[PDB]
Scaffold this active site. Structure first.
Site, PDB file in Angstrom:
ATOM      1  CG  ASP A   1      -1.913  -1.076   1.286  1.00  0.00           C
ATOM      2  OD1 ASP A   1      -2.637  -1.273   0.287  1.00  0.00           O
ATOM      3  OD2 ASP A   1      -1.991  -1.755   2.332  1.00  0.00           O
TER       4      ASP A   1
ATOM      5  N   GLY B   1      -6.312   5.917  -8.452  1.00  0.00           N
ATOM      6  CA  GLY B   1      -5.995   7.217  -9.015  1.00  0.00           C
ATOM      7  C   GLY B   1      -5.969   7.286 -10.533  1.00  0.00           C
TER       8      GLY B   1
ATOM      9  CG  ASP C   1     -12.466  -4.431  -4.196  1.00  0.00           C
ATOM     10  OD1 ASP C   1     -11.472  -5.099  -3.849  1.00  0.00           O
ATOM     11  OD2 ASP C   1     -12.383  -3.261  -4.628  1.00  0.00           O
TER      12      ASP C   1
ATOM     13  CG  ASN D   1      -8.610  -7.574  -4.610  1.00  0.00           C
ATOM     14  OD1 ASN D   1      -7.461  -7.899  -4.334  1.00  0.00           O
ATOM     15  ND2 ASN D   1      -8.894  -6.527  -5.375  1.00  0.00           N
TER      16      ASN D   1
END
Ligand code: NI
Length: 531
Positions: free
Chosen positions: A248, A313, A385, A450
């Site tokens: 991260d 981003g 996700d 994920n």
């Protein structure tokens, strides 16, 4: 200017050129970027490199428009060394089906075609090897691995191989699935590689070194024991079991970057400990040009010679001065900064929703469509996700469901995986099945799968989820979330069709290194890059 040997690199100013130039300087050479034909003259150039990435037509058009055709041809006729990389190599052919109207330099009279995706994932993303042969060159070693990332290639057959031989070409072959294709070519002063040496760790640096030095070292005298261990058995289509290290990138209280030398050193450590890829999860009034995440990549790129991915981003942004910068250009900036792939998250869901709304068609406005049309599907990864949702029967939801082996609270035997957005803070009414198929249709080249429910658990990957997604799409699927010990990787590679495994906290906390995992998988008969 003359204190060290200079290497001229043609720069069409598109994509990651950081790694290649950093690799060349690392080898003790001075790099001279050639953006215009005015930037170099035949007699004064002794080493020329033609790097290229993305859509074939996009690259060749850019190249010939800038006026490089004649200069390149003249340089080749002088007998002096030239090396092509990826699209640089494909630019030597007649052209490519990827861009029907484009013509190549045509030194090899056939066109590049797309890999057959009915038997394997396309694009080919991973570490493949050169088939053993008497005519290898520039130290290509069948027992080492090189990084390939492409959908199109010079696919071979008996006839093309003979014509090339009689033509005086030396070919380094590779095989992905049942298809044999060109890994590298060599004829007189022309040398080219389909794989990216600057992304192939030490094995790759050696190839660049051998070319710059014009030498073909003999391959090491490996013991029959070592060969049987390092040879390609064509399991997983011929690609090694890809191990990804993820970290991260946050901004703390003081404004510093943390998990800016922290994210950088950790990526270096991952690289040194065998990571096949390093993924940066960017969770950060600063102008785009000065984004600290960009410096992290640039610094990391100076020594980490494996692919780099950045997620977070990469979307349409409004700069500090009000400038409207679209996703495509934001991506171009990270690419030129050292990134090789960009991960799309929230936008992926919006894009997929729109896709179905338009009647299963794209309108070309999604970040997925724009980035992939320019850089290729291989440059775009979708971060998904999902979370399990049980139902009594396929009839309780419009989304695709599958029969699970683990009954729900009330005995439900079916489930679907509901996707979320905004860091998993908001769920949408779209299953992972539908999300991935849409994104694939839109041009995505890989799925970073994920699993909210397993994330941070350290109890292994959600195996049924992996299989569910592998049933849905044809592009590579990365197993993420849940990894804790080497055995988790073994389980995914043997019990599921996962195309790669990602690890985060387990590597970050130092519990295990990428090597520990590789040693274990290696001990269990799996093929892994070892460099
Ligand atoms: Ni000099």
């Amino acid at each position: 200017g003359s204190h060290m040997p200079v290497v001229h690199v043609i720069d069409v100013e598109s994509g990651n050129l950081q790694s290649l130039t950093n690799a060349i300087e690392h080898l003790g050479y001075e790099v001279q970027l050639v953006k215009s034909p005015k930037d170099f003259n035949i007699s004064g150039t002794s080493r020329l490199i033609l790097p290229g990435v993305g859509n074939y037509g996009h690259f060749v058009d850019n190249l010939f428009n800038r006026g490089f055709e004649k200069p390149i041809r003249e340089y080749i006729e002088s007998g002096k060394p030239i090396m092509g990389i990826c699209v640089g190599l494909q630019a030597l052919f007649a052209g490519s089906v990827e861009s029907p109207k484009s013509t190549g330099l045509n030194y090899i009279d056939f066109k590049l075609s797309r890999f057959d995706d009915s038997e394997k994932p396309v694009p080919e993303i991973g570490w493949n090897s050169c088939i053993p042969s008497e005519n290898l060159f520039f130290g290509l070693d069948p027992y080492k691995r090189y990084y390939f990332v492409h959908s199109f290639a010079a696919i071979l057959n008996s006839e093309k191989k003979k014509n090339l031989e009689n033509d005086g070409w030396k070919i380094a072959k590779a095989k992905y699935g049942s298809e044999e294709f060109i890994a590298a070519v060599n004829k007189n002063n022309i040398f080219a590689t389909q794989f990216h040496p600057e992304k192939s760790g030490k094995a790759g640096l050696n190839v660049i070194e051998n070319f710059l030095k014009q030498q073909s070292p003999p391959i090491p005298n490996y013991s029959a024991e070592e060969k049987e261990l390092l040879m390609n058995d064509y399991s997983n289509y011929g690609l090694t079991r890809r191990i990804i290290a993820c970290l991260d990138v946050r901004t703390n209280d003081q404004g510093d970057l943390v998990v800016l030398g922290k994210p950088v050193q950790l990526a270096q450590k991952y690289y040194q400990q065998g990571a096949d890829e390093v993924t940066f999860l960017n969770i950060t009034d600063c102008p785009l040009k000065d984004t600290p995440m960009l410096e992290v990549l640039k610094q990391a790129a100076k020594t980490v010679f494996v692919p780099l991915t950045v997620g977070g981003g990469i979307k349409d942004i409004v700069d500090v001065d009000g400038t409207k910068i679209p996703a495509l250009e934001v991506a171009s900036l990270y690419f030129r900064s050292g990134a090789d792939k960009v991960s799309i998250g929230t936008d992926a869901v919006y894009a997929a929703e729109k896709y179905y709304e338009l009647g299963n068609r794209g309108d070309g406005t999604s970040p997925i469509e724009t980035i992939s049309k320019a850089y290729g599907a291989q440059a775009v990864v979708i971060s998904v996700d999902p979370k399990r949702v049980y139902v009594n029967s396929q009839a309780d939801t419009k989304n695709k469901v599958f029969e699970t082996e683990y009954p729900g609270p009330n005995g439900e035997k079916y489930c679907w995986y509901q996707c979320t957005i905004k860091g998993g803070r908001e769920s949408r009414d779209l299953g992972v099945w539908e999300l991935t198929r849409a994104c694939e249709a839109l041009g995505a080249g890989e799925i970073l799968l994920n699993c909210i429910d397993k994330d941070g658990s350290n109890s292994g990957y959600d195996l049924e989820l992996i299989e569910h997604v592998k049933d849905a799409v044809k592009i590579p699927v990365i197993a993420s979330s849940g990894a804790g010990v080497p055995e988790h990787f073994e389980e995914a590679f043997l019990k599921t069709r996962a195309d790669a495994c990602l690890g985060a906290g387990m590597f970050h906390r130092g519990e295990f290194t990428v090597n520990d995992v590789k040693e274990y998988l290696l001990e269990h008969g799996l093929k892994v890059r070892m460099d």
